[PDB]
Structure formats: C-alpha cells, structure tokens
Amino acid sequence: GMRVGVLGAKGKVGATMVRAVAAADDLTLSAELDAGDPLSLLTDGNTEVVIDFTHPDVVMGNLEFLIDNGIHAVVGTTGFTAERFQQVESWLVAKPNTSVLIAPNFAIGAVLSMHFAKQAARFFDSAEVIELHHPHKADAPSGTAARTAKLIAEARKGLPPNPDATSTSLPGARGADVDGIPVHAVRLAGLVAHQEVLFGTEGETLTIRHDSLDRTSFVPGVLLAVRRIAERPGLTVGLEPLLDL
Amino acid sequence: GMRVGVLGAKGKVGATMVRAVAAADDLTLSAELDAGDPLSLLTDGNTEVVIDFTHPDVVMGNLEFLIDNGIHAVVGTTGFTAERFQQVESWLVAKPNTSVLIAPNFAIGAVLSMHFAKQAARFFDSAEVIELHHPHKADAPSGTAARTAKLIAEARKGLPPNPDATSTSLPGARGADVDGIPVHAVRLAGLVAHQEVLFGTEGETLTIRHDSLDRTSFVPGVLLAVRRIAERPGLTVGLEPLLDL
Amino acid sequence: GMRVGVLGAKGKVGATMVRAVAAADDLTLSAELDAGDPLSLLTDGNTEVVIDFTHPDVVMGNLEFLIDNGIHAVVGTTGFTAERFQQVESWLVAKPNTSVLIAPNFAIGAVLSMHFAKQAARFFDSAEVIELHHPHKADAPSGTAARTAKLIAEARKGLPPNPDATSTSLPGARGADVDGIPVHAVRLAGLVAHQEVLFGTEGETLTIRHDSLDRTSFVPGVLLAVRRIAERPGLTVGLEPLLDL
Amino acid sequence: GMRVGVLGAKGKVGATMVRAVAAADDLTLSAELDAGDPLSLLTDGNTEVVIDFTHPDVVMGNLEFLIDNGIHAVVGTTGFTAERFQQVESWLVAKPNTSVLIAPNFAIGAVLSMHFAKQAARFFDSAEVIELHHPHKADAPSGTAARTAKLIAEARKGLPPNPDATSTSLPGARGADVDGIPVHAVRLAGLVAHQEVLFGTEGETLTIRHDSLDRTSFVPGVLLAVRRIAERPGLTVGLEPLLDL
Ligand SMILES: NC(=O)c1ccc[n+]([C@@H]2O[C@H](COP(=O)([O-])OP(=O)(O)OC[C@H]3O[C@@H](n4cnc5c(N)ncnc54)[C@H](OP(=O)(O)O)[C@@H]3O)[C@@H](O)[C@H]2O)c1
Ligand SMILES: NC(=O)c1ccc[n+]([C@@H]2O[C@H](COP(=O)([O-])OP(=O)(O)OC[C@H]3O[C@@H](n4cnc5c(N)ncnc54)[C@H](OP(=O)(O)O)[C@@H]3O)[C@@H](O)[C@H]2O)c1
Ligand SMILES: NC(=O)c1ccc[n+]([C@@H]2O[C@H](COP(=O)([O-])OP(=O)(O)OC[C@H]3O[C@@H](n4cnc5c(N)ncnc54)[C@H](OP(=O)(O)O)[C@@H]3O)[C@@H](O)[C@H]2O)c1
Ligand SMILES: NC(=O)c1ccc[n+]([C@@H]2O[C@H](COP(=O)([O-])OP(=O)(O)OC[C@H]3O[C@@H](n4cnc5c(N)ncnc54)[C@H](OP(=O)(O)O)[C@@H]3O)[C@@H](O)[C@H]2O)c1
Ligand SMILES: O=C(O)c1cccc(C(=O)O)n1
Ligand SMILES: O=C(O)c1cccc(C(=O)O)n1
Ligand SMILES: O=C(O)c1cccc(C(=O)O)n1
Ligand SMILES: O=C(O)c1cccc(C(=O)O)n1
Ligand SMILES: [Cl-]
Ligand SMILES: [Cl-]
Ligand SMILES: [Cl-]
Ligand SMILES: [Cl-]
Ligand SMILES: [Cl-]
Ligand SMILES: [Cl-]
Ligand SMILES: [Cl-]
Ligand SMILES: [Cl-]
Ligand SMILES: [Cl-]
Ligand SMILES: [Cl-]
Ligand SMILES: [Cl-]
Ligand SMILES: [Cl-]
C-alpha cells in the first residue's frame, strides 16, 4: 500500500489521476491539492509519493518542497531543461533516499516514438518534429517534442546538419531550433496531444506519429512510475528506464 | 499555334515544362533561357508567351522586361506579395493588351485545397497551415501556404482570433504569422511539395492535405494558363479564375 | 420550448446527448430510453421529438413507432440504405406533418468533407475512402464512408472507373466496393471516429481527413436538427440541407 | 568487380536499376533482359549476380534458372509466400555456393518500419496495416504489408486477437486477414509506394508511415545486397539481415 497525493488535482490531467488513484486497490489518495492549497497538506496527510500535473511556473517549487520532505515525486508537468534537471539533482544530494521521476510523456506510444526516433536518426539526411496540442497548453514546443529533438540530435552527433537552402523567410516559419532540429508547434481546438517525427533521405520519408486522443492514455505510465518510484533513488528522466526496450 | 519561351529551362520545374511544350501539338518552343542568358533571346525568337520558374530574386526583373515587350507571362516562381502584385499592375497600365497570370501552385489538388480552405474557415475556431517541401527551396513559407493563410484570414474577417494560451516558448515554435494564421515550413530530403490545412473546433478537426509527388503535376495547369493567357488582359492571380469552381 | 426524448440514453453518444438536452435552455428532456424500455414511455412523457443513437438492428422499428405516433425524429444510428430510406418515406405518406432527419454524421468537419468530396471528384482519376473507428462499432463500413462513396460515384457518373491493375489478391484486400469506390474500414482501440477521402491523378493526391476525437463533436449538429426538425415535413437525409453550403 | 544482370530492365524499377549499375564503378552491366528475352542471355554475358524486378507470375521460373546456373540473385519482385520460399530453399540444396536474397522492400524507411512494428506490437491491443500504391501494381496486398503483418502477428503470439465488434458488413470492408492482422490495399493514381502501420490501445494510437516518393529510394538497398550477396550462401529474406539493427 502507498499513500499518493496529486498536485493539480482539478486540472485536466490531474482530475484523471485522482480517479485512477482512487480506483487502484494498492494506492490510497492522501491529498488532492489545487492552486492556492499549501504544500503542508501533503505532510499533514502522511503522503509518501506525489503525482504532479501543474504548470511550468510552479513545478520547481513543488519539487523543492517534496525533496526536502522526503516525498517521492512522479512529475508530468513540462517546462524542463537541463539546468532544471541539474537543480533537481543538486537538491537530491541532501536527500539520498528520495526518488524523483520526471517524464514529458507517460503514454506508451510517445515513449516508443522517442525510442524509434533515436534508432532511425542516423539513416536519414533530414529530421524535424511537428507537435500538435490543444490551445490551453502553456509551453511551446511541448516537453515531448523537445526531448525527441534532443535524442535525434544526440544520435546524429558528427553527421551533417539537415540540408536547407532557405534564403528568404518570414520570422518563425522554420520552427524553433532544438539542437539543430526544427520543431513546430500547432495549437488547435479539438486536439489533445499529438506528435509527428519526420525523417527524409533520397526519394523517401519515414514518419512516426503518436496521438493521445484521451488523457486516460497517461494513466498506465503514471501508475507504473508511482508503483516503482522508490526502486531508483535520485532522478530518473523519462519513463523508458522503467521499461524493457 | 503559339510561340512559348521558358525561363528557368534547366531548373527542376522548368525542364519539365520545356518537355511539355515540346510535346504539345499546338505550342512551339521559341526560347529556353537559363541563368546568365539575356532576355533579348525571347524577342529574337519572336516569343508570344513565357513560362517562368526561376527564383524570387529575379522574377520581377523578368516581368518588367516581358511586360515592356508585350510578351504574356505565366509565372510559377514564388516570393510574391501584395506590393509586388501592385507593381506588376502598375507596369501593365502602360501595356493594356498584355496578360500576366501568377500562381503559387498549378496542381489541381492545391487549387482545390485553397478553395476548400476558404469554404471551411468560418466553421472552426482554429486554423493553421503546415507546408513541407524539398530542402532546395529558397522561400519559407511557400507561396501556396502564404496564399492559403491569406484566404483563411479573409474568410474569418470579424471572427475571433485562434485561441492560444502559450506563455513560455522558444523563438519560432509557433510558426510564421500570416494575417493571424500560423504557418509552419518543413524542409526535408525526400519530399517534393506538400501542404496540410488544419481546422479545429470542439471535439474535432478537419485536415485538407495536398501532395505533389512529381513535378508532372504542375504541367496541366501551366499549359491551361498558357493556352488561355490572352483571354484576360492585365493581371490574374491564381489558377482558380480559369476554372469552374 | 420542446420536449425531447433520447433513444439509446445510456450509450456512448446517447449519454452525451442526454447531457446536452438537459443543459439546453429551450429543450426539456421528456424520456431517456435504454434497451428493454418500451417505446410507450415516449408517448407517456408527451415527447415531441426524439434523438436516436441506438443500433442498426432496432432503428427501423423505432422509426416505425415514432412516425405512427407523429413524433419527429433526429436519427444518428447508421445501417441505412436506399431501401430503408424508401421504407421511411412510405411510412411518412400516412403522417404528412411528421419530420424525420437521418444523418450518418452530425460533426461539421464530416459534413464539409462530404461536400468537398462531391466538388473534387471529377478532377481525379482515382478515389477511395478509408474510415477508422473504435472497435465497438457494429457496422462496416461506417454510414459516413458509405455516403461519401455514393456522393463521389454520383459526381463521377460517365467518367472512367478507377484504374486498377490488380491480378493477384487476397480476399478483401481491396476493400468493399460502394458504387465503384473502394471503402476500407479500420477498427482500432484508441480511436473515436475518423475518415480520409483520397483522390489521385498524375503526380499528385488530395486527402480530406476528418477526425472526431470526442463525441461532443456531434452535439451542435444534433441540437440544430432538433431545433429545426419540424421546418421540413417528411424525410431529410444528412445535415447539409440545414446548412448554407 | 562484379558482372550484374537486370531482369525487368525496361520496367519502372528495373530501368532505375540499370542506370544505377551502369553508374557504379565496381559493377559492370552484363545483361538487360526484358519480357520475351531468353534467360540464356545471362550465361552468354558471364553474369555473376542478377537483380530481378519483374512480375509475380515469372519470378519463380527466373529463380529456378538462376540457381541451377549458380547465378546469385537479388530479388525485389513480390508475390512471395512461405511455400515459395521453401521451394527456393529446396532448389538451393543442389547449389550450396549460390546466394539468393529476396526482399519486399529495399527502402530503408520500410525496413525500419518493419523493425519498429515488431518492437511495438506487444504494447497495443489493436494492429492493422494500410498500404497505398500506384494503380499499375499487380499484387494486393503488397509484399511489404504482408511481411509487416506477419511480423506483428509473430510478435503477438499468445496475446488476444484485435478487438472487433463488427456484426454487419459489406464484403471486403475489413481488409484481408494476414495471420489475424487486417491489411487494406489502396490503389491510387499519383502514388508510388506507401504504408502505414497502425497500433491502438486505450486513449492512444501509434502510426509508423513510410513513403517512397521516387524509385531511387530502392537503389541503395539493392546495391548493398548486390555487393554483399555472396557473403551468405543460401536464402536471405529481407534486407534487415545485412544491416545493424
Ligand atoms: N507527462 C505527460 O504525460 C503529460 C500529459 C499531459 C500534460 N502534461 C503536462 O502536465 C501539465 C498539466 O497539464 P494540464 O493540461 O492538466 O493542465 P491544466 O488543466 O491547466 O491543469 C493544471 C492544474 O494545476 C493547477 N495548479 C496550478 N498551480 C498549482 C499549485 N501550485 N499547486 C497545485 N495545483 C496547481 C491548476 O490550477 P489553475 O488552473 O487554477 O491555475 C490546474 O488545475 C502541463 O505542464 C502539461 O504540459 C504532461
Ligand atoms: N507555381 C507552382 O506550381 C510552382 C511549382 C514548383 C515550384 N514553384 C516555384 O518555382 C520556382 C522554381 O522552382 P524549382 O524547384 O524549379 O527551382 P530550380 O530547380 O532552382 O530552378 C530554377 C531555375 O531558374 C534558373 N534561373 C535563375 N535565374 C534565372 C534567370 N534570370 N533567367 C533564367 N533562369 C534563371 C536557375 O539557374 P541556377 O540554378 O543556375 O541559378 C534554375 O535552373 C521557385 O520559386 C518555386 O517556389 C512553383
Ligand atoms: N450520426 C452520427 O453523427 C453518429 C455519431 C456516432 C455514432 N453514430 C451511430 O450511432 C449509433 C450508436 O453509437 P454508439 O457508439 O453510441 O453505440 P452504443 O454505445 O452501443 O450505444 C447504443 C445504445 O443504444 C442502446 N439500445 C439498443 N437497443 C435499444 C432500443 N431498442 N431502445 C433504446 N436503446 C437501445 C444500447 O443498449 P445496449 O448496449 O444494452 O444494447 C446502447 O446503450 C451507431 O449506429 C453509430 O454508428 C452516429
Ligand atoms: N522490393 C522492393 O523494394 C520493390 C520496389 C518496387 C517494386 N517491387 C516489386 O517489383 C516488381 C516490379 O515492379 P515494377 O513497378 O517495376 O513493375 P513493371 O514496371 O511492370 O516492371 C516489370 C518489368 O518486368 C518485365 N518482365 C515481365 N516478365 C519478364 C521476364 N520473364 N523477363 C524479364 N522481364 C520481364 C515487364 O515487361 P512487360 O511490362 O512487357 O510485361 C516489365 O518491363 C513488382 O513485383 C513490384 O511489386 C519491389
Ligand atoms: O510533451 C508535453 O508537453 C505534453 C505531453 C502530453 C500532453 C501535454 C499537454 O496536454 O499539454 N503535453
Ligand atoms: O507554393 C510554392 O512555393 C511551391 C509550390 C509547389 C512547389 C514549390 C517548390 O518546389 O518550391 N513551391
Ligand atoms: O458514419 C458512422 O457510421 C459513424 C459516424 C461517427 C461515429 C460513429 C460511431 O462511433 O460508430 N459512426
Ligand atoms: O511491397 C511491395 O509489394 C512493393 C514495395 C515497393 C514498391 C512496390 C511496387 O511499386 O509495386 N511494391
Ligand atoms: Cl535543455
Ligand atoms: Cl532521503
Ligand atoms: Cl521516455
Ligand atoms: Cl502580402
Ligand atoms: Cl500591350
Ligand atoms: Cl488558385
Ligand atoms: Cl443503398
Ligand atoms: Cl402527421
Ligand atoms: Cl451531410
Ligand atoms: Cl505465407
Ligand atoms: Cl553452387
Ligand atoms: Cl527487412
């Protein structure tokens, strides 16, 4: 048994997670915190692990508190960068038995997409990422598309950059540059969370597309991380380290 | 019978057009000009109409010469803007029997896409355009995607802008802004010319996608324009005015 | 004000419609019938119009009762064919003030798709339809894909059939034949309701794709039909006749 | 140096291969055979290896001759089945130094697609394959889509079948059944060779799409196989065994 708190409990993903923890036989909901609730509600309820689906402007402060209080964390909130991960590692030095897992996508199709993008990258001259999300999303590009681009760029270390003869452009047409990989962010009513990774070489392309049509797609990955969180003290990035790929 | 010259005759599209004019029974090839050939080769050969698939940095000078010499023009080269079209109209005042048609896409699927985008626009909260071309293309976004965005924006005059809660972004992630419509330009080895128009509202999306897999797709539209060019003195923009839509 | 009953009130779409009628200020929910509820509950509650999202094996019997009792009907259930529509018209002769509207898709993107497919059809050598739905769906192909194929085939009356050199095949690989147009039905966990209409000619294709990611996408079209149902006595097929296209 | 013959030398792919062998510094074109040319032209020219892009009705007879004469073969022609591969293995028992490689796709994006489909299969409840080719293709479904389906089915040995509630259908709507995996074949003017592998589970899908826009995409894989053919005596199926995946 495990006492699980949710940060962002009234949000689109957090409300899904509250229902999932409540339904799980081996997990007990110990706290449901919304904006304006004090983090001390987590220690009042004897919370052992927290699920965080909040906002990029608040998640680092949530983590600072969770780590100082020895509460393990499964974080889906995005906005992460290498400097933020370094900061989380710095806080965890003081708390060597506390575990944090931060992943920009808990859906298995997105995890597989990032795995396949790493494997495909060296076979193609060009790579770009298009991500498409609902228009309530705070951050562009998405966490998943920034990680995918970073993985592709690492895989292509020492190979030529993408070819591109653009000489006349409007500002922003060619996307954001993430480690040399263009990333484009579409924000469209009707969508949930979607990504296409595009690879090209002479005469052919390969596209790896993931679509989450419902936030229920995030639940299995979050619950797996919650259940296994204390196995790996310190910081884990991504869900892939918990899987057999 | 008609004496047709090609500007850009060694280019990817221009070489296709040379073969098409040579094959056509009712057209005679009167000039094939490449970079560094003087435009006087067109008047030397008694050229009546020219097909131009060259480069955005040279097409206005080609038009200035064609119009001054009363040679009708079918222009596929992109880079056009309202100011350039105004300039072409200004030159045509002096030459009231000369005809110019400038279109950013001669493929029927792209013409139909722009027509359907205009019809769909008022039914959706969000609209964006993704275009994807080979990595030798000079201009981003494409002529076709800029015209599509302009048509959507005109169709949505007086309706609310696209919803977008982005508050933290990398530069360029949200595309170029064409009259309030995001346009994203992918440049990928393997591609020819492709575009997706995306519309969204509560719970649903509509995507109109055109793919030219071969530059032969441009030939029917160019030959139609060549054959009908002298029907409309002055400037025609797009191929749609020659069609029954 | 209008007294609206729902047939299929516990189903995936019907439960969405119950919530929508309950929320609407101008509509009153008069009956919510599930499998095994007698249709007399509709007359007991003084129902004026019914929304039907049930099953192909029961909808004709529901209509026979609704028409005999002068209750107008907005039907989304699929399984319809020309013979069934003829039967509905035959029953309506006896009840000249009763209105029935039967549509295989109430989402505006699907209505627009069918409208654009009709306009595009004569410009292309080939046309096919791919539809993709959740794996609880009873009927293949979908109502929407059969109507789209029928519209394309009517539009192409007198033009050559799709080209196809297939000489060796496994049974079923080339889809169902709807009036000469191949229709393919994908049934996949994760999906809701999706369709791609594909057109092809030399060197190019045009794809019109509609995606309903949530059954809320059907609500505006159903409520519009409910509100306008008594305007057109007799049978209306599709939602397009209520729109300005 | 290597003496290479092409069977199907005037075909769409074979003409591409003739040009590639002629351009390669380490290969010499020893024969170019078209329909109605006798296979003895291969032995007359001292051919060491042949590339075969012909037709399903003739390739087994070509192989019977090639193997009996000790000529190694790189075969792209489709129509293969397990019984045909068993027959090729039976002929190779008599000729233990002769090598044959038969692959249904030599484009790296298709090879990678089949590799990723095998890795993804066990994570999803549903899987189907859509393939889309030009309308001159003899066989449906394609060789690549049949192999992809077979790989997915092998990967899912012991897992539940795809869910499917279909109870009313038109014949062929649900595709061909390849080892329990639906395969749908679109034949459309404008296309070259394309495939989408679709996987689904609760709330999400993963699509792996490969597009060959030009038959030049097949050349690198064929030349690699030609260059390495004698390394593996006997039969090799697919190009994957020559790669590091
Ligand atoms: N890793 C993944 O698989 C994955 C999947 C989906 C989303 N995401 C990411 O998860 C995050 C949440 O997405 P969402 O769509 O669910 O957003 P959302 O609907 O806006 O939900 C976030 C919730 O957090 C609340 N909140 C804000 N500050 C808080 C605080 N200090 N303590 C507790 N709650 C707080 C918000 O309240 P207010 O609205 O009142 O401010 C809101 O209810 C985003 O960063 C998103 O990119 C990740
Ligand atoms: N409307 C449509 O349907 C459509 C379809 C395709 C492309 N396009 C547009 O058409 C244009 C050409 O595209 P492309 O892919 O064919 O480009 P490309 O392969 O670069 O061909 C352009 C050709 O024009 C030549 N050229 C440059 N300056 C010239 C001059 N002053 N006189 C004569 N020739 C000149 C170039 O020579 P160098 O290479 O030596 O400079 C080149 O051979 C681009 O603007 C493109 O966006 C339009
Ligand atoms: N036009 C459109 O826009 C549109 C949109 C979506 C769906 N559809 C179509 O709408 C239909 C329903 O789809 P769905 O996904 O909502 O199916 P569903 O979840 O199976 O719902 C149908 C409901 O009808 C109930 N039912 C069966 N017989 C009945 C009867 N005689 N009286 C009252 N209720 C009865 C079922 O009960 P049991 O489960 O107990 O039998 C079930 O709860 C299907 O034909 C579908 O193709 C149309
Ligand atoms: N593995 C891959 O990567 C790959 C890629 C593309 C295609 N394919 C497959 O390759 C095959 C060829 O495709 P394609 O599009 O190139 O077809 P195609 O254009 O019809 O070419 C086949 C050529 O083979 C000729 N031919 C027929 N019988 C022959 C014989 N006994 N000896 C020599 N030549 C003969 C044909 O002549 P006629 O037209 O006069 O009969 C034709 O010119 C098909 O099975 C296709 O599915 C495989
Ligand atoms: O990668 C991300 O940023 C991500 C992934 C899934 C959903 C969302 C979201 O809904 O914002 N964001
Ligand atoms: O809209 C355009 O800019 C366009 C259209 C088709 C082809 C090309 C090209 O190949 O550059 N560009
Ligand atoms: O055209 C149809 O058959 C259709 C349309 C939307 C949804 C559904 C469904 O969910 O079955 N079916
Ligand atoms: O898998 C196949 O059957 C295949 C693969 C690529 C091209 C072709 C073809 O053009 O027929 N066929
Ligand atoms: Cl970073
Ligand atoms: Cl600790
Ligand atoms: Cl991961
Ligand atoms: Cl402009
Ligand atoms: Cl004049
Ligand atoms: Cl136009
Ligand atoms: Cl019918
Ligand atoms: Cl009546
Ligand atoms: Cl309709
Ligand atoms: Cl087999
Ligand atoms: Cl031997
Ligand atoms: Cl392979």
Side-chain angles (χ1 to χ4, degrees):
Chain A
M2 222 180 256
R3 295 185 67 78
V4 186
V6 181
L7 292 180
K10 300 186 174 309
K12 290 187 292 298
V13 181
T16 297
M17 298 296 159
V18 169
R19 288 186 274 280
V21 173
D25 290 331
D26 61 321
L27 306 178
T28 298
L29 190 66
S30 61
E32 299 161 70
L33 282 64
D34 182 28
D37 294 328
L39 294 162
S40 58
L41 292 172
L42 295 172
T43 48
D44 287 345
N46 189 27
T47 295
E48 281 147 10
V49 58
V50 170
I51 299 168
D52 187 307
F53 287 95
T54 56
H55 189 277
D57 282 336
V58 301
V59 64
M60 290 291 285
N62 292 347
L63 282 164
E64 192 178 22
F65 176 94
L66 292 165
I67 292 164
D68 189 46
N69 284 274
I71 299 173
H72 306 299
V74 173
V75 180
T77 307
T78 53
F80 288 88
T81 61
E83 290 181 20
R84 287 178 173 79
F85 294 140
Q86 288 155 8
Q87 181 64 75
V88 172
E89 292 169 343
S90 290
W91 288 330
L92 285 166
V93 172
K95 304 291 290 183
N97 297 308
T98 300
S99 299
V100 174
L101 184 150
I102 296 172
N105 208 304
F106 282 96
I108 188 58
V111 176
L112 289 171
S113 292
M114 290 184 280
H115 178 71
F116 297 157
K118 182 175 173 188
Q119 287 173 252
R122 70 192 190 268
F123 288 99
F124 294 94
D125 305 69
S126 298
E128 297 199 15
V129 180
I130 298 171
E131 54 92 333
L132 316 93
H133 291 74
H134 59 88
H136 306 290
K137 182 165 179 58
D139 50 315
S142 68
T144 295
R147 178 168 164 77
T148 299
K150 287 183 224 184
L151 290 164
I152 291 171
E154 184 54 58
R156 287 181 47 188
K157 189 169 70 61
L159 294 182
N162 285 353
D164 182 9
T166 302
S167 61
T168 180
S169 184
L170 296 181
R174 293 286 290 117
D177 171 26
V178 177
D179 297 344
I181 301 304
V183 181
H184 306 278
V186 169
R187 296 288 177 268
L188 204 91
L191 297 182
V192 175
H194 315 266
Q195 180 176 279
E196 294 200 340
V197 186
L198 304 82
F199 290 107
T201 185
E202 168 64 25
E204 63 171 303
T205 66
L206 175 65
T207 299
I208 304 163
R209 179 176 179 119
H210 181 245
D211 290 286
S212 278
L213 292 89
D214 195 317
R215 295 164 176 86
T216 55
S217 66
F218 303 118
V219 172
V222 171
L223 291 186
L224 174 67
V226 168
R227 289 169 176 137
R228 301 190 37 201
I229 193 51
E231 288 173 13
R232 304 160 70 80
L235 176 60
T236 298
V237 178
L239 186 64
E240 187 272 347
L242 305 190
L243 305 173
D244 194 46
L245 325 186
Chain B
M2 222 180 256
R3 295 185 67 78
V4 186
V6 181
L7 292 180
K10 300 186 174 309
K12 290 187 292 298
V13 181
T16 297
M17 298 296 159
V18 169
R19 288 186 274 280
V21 173
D25 290 331
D26 61 321
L27 306 178
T28 298
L29 190 66
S30 61
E32 299 161 70
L33 282 64
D34 182 28
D37 294 328
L39 294 162
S40 58
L41 292 172
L42 295 172
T43 48
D44 287 345
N46 189 27
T47 295
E48 281 147 10
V49 58
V50 170
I51 299 168
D52 187 307
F53 287 95
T54 56
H55 189 277
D57 282 336
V58 301
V59 64
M60 290 291 285
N62 292 347
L63 282 164
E64 192 178 22
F65 176 94
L66 292 165
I67 292 164
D68 189 46
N69 284 274
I71 299 173
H72 306 299
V74 173
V75 180
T77 307
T78 53
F80 288 88
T81 61
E83 290 181 20
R84 287 178 173 79
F85 294 140
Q86 288 155 8
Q87 181 64 75
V88 172
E89 292 169 343
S90 290
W91 288 330
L92 285 166
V93 172
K95 304 291 290 183
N97 297 308
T98 300
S99 299
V100 174
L101 184 150
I102 296 172
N105 208 304
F106 282 96
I108 188 58
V111 176
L112 289 171
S113 292
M114 290 184 280
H115 178 71
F116 297 157
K118 182 175 173 188
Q119 287 173 252
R122 70 192 190 268
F123 288 99
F124 294 94
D125 305 69
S126 298
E128 297 199 15
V129 180
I130 298 171
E131 54 92 333
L132 316 93
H133 291 74
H134 59 88
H136 306 290
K137 182 165 179 58
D139 50 315
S142 68
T144 295
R147 178 168 164 77
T148 299
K150 287 183 224 184
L151 290 164
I152 291 171
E154 184 54 58
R156 287 181 47 188
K157 189 169 70 61
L159 294 182
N162 285 353
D164 182 9
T166 302
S167 61
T168 180
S169 184
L170 296 181
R174 293 286 290 117
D177 171 26
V178 177
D179 297 344
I181 301 304
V183 181
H184 306 278
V186 169
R187 296 288 177 268
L188 204 91
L191 297 182
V192 175
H194 315 266
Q195 180 176 279
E196 294 200 340
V197 186
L198 304 82
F199 290 107
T201 185
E202 168 64 25
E204 63 171 303
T205 66
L206 175 65
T207 299
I208 304 163
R209 179 176 179 119
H210 181 245
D211 290 286
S212 278
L213 292 89
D214 195 317
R215 295 164 176 86
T216 55
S217 66
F218 303 118
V219 172
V222 171
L223 291 186
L224 174 67
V226 168
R227 289 169 176 137
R228 301 190 37 201
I229 193 51
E231 288 173 13
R232 304 160 70 80
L235 176 60
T236 298
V237 178
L239 186 64
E240 187 272 347
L242 305 190
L243 305 173
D244 194 46
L245 325 186
Chain C
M2 222 180 256
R3 295 185 67 78
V4 186
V6 181
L7 292 180
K10 300 186 174 309
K12 290 187 292 298
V13 181
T16 297
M17 298 296 159
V18 169
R19 288 186 274 280
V21 173
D25 290 331
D26 61 321
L27 306 178
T28 298
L29 190 66
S30 61
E32 299 161 70
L33 282 64
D34 182 28
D37 294 328
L39 294 162
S40 58
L41 292 172
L42 295 172
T43 48
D44 287 345
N46 189 27
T47 295
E48 281 147 10
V49 58
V50 170
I51 299 168
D52 187 307
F53 287 95
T54 56
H55 189 277
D57 282 336
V58 301
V59 64
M60 290 291 285
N62 292 347
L63 282 164
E64 192 178 22
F65 176 94
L66 292 165
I67 292 164
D68 189 46
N69 284 274
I71 299 173
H72 306 299
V74 173
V75 180
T77 307
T78 53
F80 288 88
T81 61
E83 290 181 20
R84 287 178 173 79
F85 294 140
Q86 288 155 8
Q87 181 64 75
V88 172
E89 292 169 343
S90 290
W91 288 330
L92 285 166
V93 172
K95 304 291 290 183
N97 297 308
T98 300
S99 299
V100 174
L101 184 150
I102 296 172
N105 208 304
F106 282 96
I108 188 58
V111 176
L112 289 171
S113 292
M114 290 184 280
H115 178 71
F116 297 157
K118 182 175 173 188
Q119 287 173 252
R122 70 192 190 268
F123 288 99
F124 294 94
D125 305 69
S126 298
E128 297 199 15
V129 180
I130 298 171
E131 54 92 333
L132 316 93
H133 291 74
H134 59 88
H136 306 290
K137 182 165 179 58
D139 50 315
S142 68
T144 295
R147 178 168 164 77
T148 299
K150 287 183 224 184
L151 290 164
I152 291 171
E154 184 54 58
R156 287 181 47 188
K157 189 169 70 61
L159 294 182
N162 285 353
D164 182 9
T166 302
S167 61
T168 180
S169 184
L170 296 181
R174 293 286 290 117
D177 171 26
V178 177
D179 297 344
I181 301 304
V183 181
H184 306 278
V186 169
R187 296 288 177 268
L188 204 91
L191 297 182
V192 175
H194 315 266
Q195 180 176 279
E196 294 200 340
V197 186
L198 304 82
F199 290 107
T201 185
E202 168 64 25
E204 63 171 303
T205 66
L206 175 65
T207 299
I208 304 163
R209 179 176 179 119
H210 181 245
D211 290 286
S212 278
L213 292 89
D214 195 317
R215 295 164 176 86
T216 55
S217 66
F218 303 118
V219 172
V222 171
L223 291 186
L224 174 67
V226 168
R227 289 169 176 137
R228 301 190 37 201
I229 193 51
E231 288 173 13
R232 304 160 70 80
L235 176 60
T236 298
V237 178
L239 186 64
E240 187 272 347
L242 305 190
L243 305 173
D244 194 46
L245 325 186
Chain D
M2 222 180 256
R3 295 185 67 78
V4 186
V6 181
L7 292 180
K10 300 186 174 309
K12 290 187 292 298
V13 181
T16 297
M17 298 296 159
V18 169
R19 288 186 274 280
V21 173
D25 290 331
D26 61 321
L27 306 178
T28 298
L29 190 66
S30 61
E32 299 161 70
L33 282 64
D34 182 28
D37 294 328
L39 294 162
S40 58
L41 292 172
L42 295 172
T43 48
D44 287 345
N46 189 27
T47 295
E48 281 147 10
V49 58
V50 170
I51 299 168
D52 187 307
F53 287 95
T54 56
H55 189 277
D57 282 336
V58 301
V59 64
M60 290 291 285
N62 292 347
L63 282 164
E64 192 178 22
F65 176 94
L66 292 165
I67 292 164
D68 189 46
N69 284 274
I71 299 173
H72 306 299
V74 173
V75 180
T77 307
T78 53
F80 288 88
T81 61
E83 290 181 20
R84 287 178 173 79
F85 294 140
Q86 288 155 8
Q87 181 64 75
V88 172
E89 292 169 343
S90 290
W91 288 330
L92 285 166
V93 172
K95 304 291 290 183
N97 297 308
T98 300
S99 299
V100 174
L101 184 150
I102 296 172
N105 208 304
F106 282 96
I108 188 58
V111 176
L112 289 171
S113 292
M114 290 184 280
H115 178 71
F116 297 157
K118 182 175 173 188
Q119 287 173 252
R122 70 192 190 268
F123 288 99
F124 294 94
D125 305 69
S126 298
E128 297 199 15
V129 180
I130 298 171
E131 54 92 333
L132 316 93
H133 291 74
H134 59 88
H136 306 290
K137 182 165 179 58
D139 50 315
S142 68
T144 295
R147 178 168 164 77
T148 299
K150 287 183 224 184
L151 290 164
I152 291 171
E154 184 54 58
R156 287 181 47 188
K157 189 169 70 61
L159 294 182
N162 285 353
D164 182 9
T166 302
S167 61
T168 180
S169 184
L170 296 181
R174 293 286 290 117
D177 171 26
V178 177
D179 297 344
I181 301 304
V183 181
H184 306 278
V186 169
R187 296 288 177 268
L188 204 91
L191 297 182
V192 175
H194 315 266
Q195 180 176 279
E196 294 200 340
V197 186
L198 304 82
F199 290 107
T201 185
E202 168 64 25
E204 63 171 303
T205 66
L206 175 65
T207 299
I208 304 163
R209 179 176 179 119
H210 181 245
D211 290 286
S212 278
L213 292 89
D214 195 317
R215 295 164 176 86
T216 55
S217 66
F218 303 118
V219 172
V222 171
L223 291 186
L224 174 67
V226 168
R227 289 169 176 137
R228 301 190 37 201
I229 193 51
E231 288 173 13
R232 304 160 70 80
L235 176 60
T236 298
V237 178
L239 186 64
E240 187 272 347
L242 305 190
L243 305 173
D244 194 46
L245 325 186

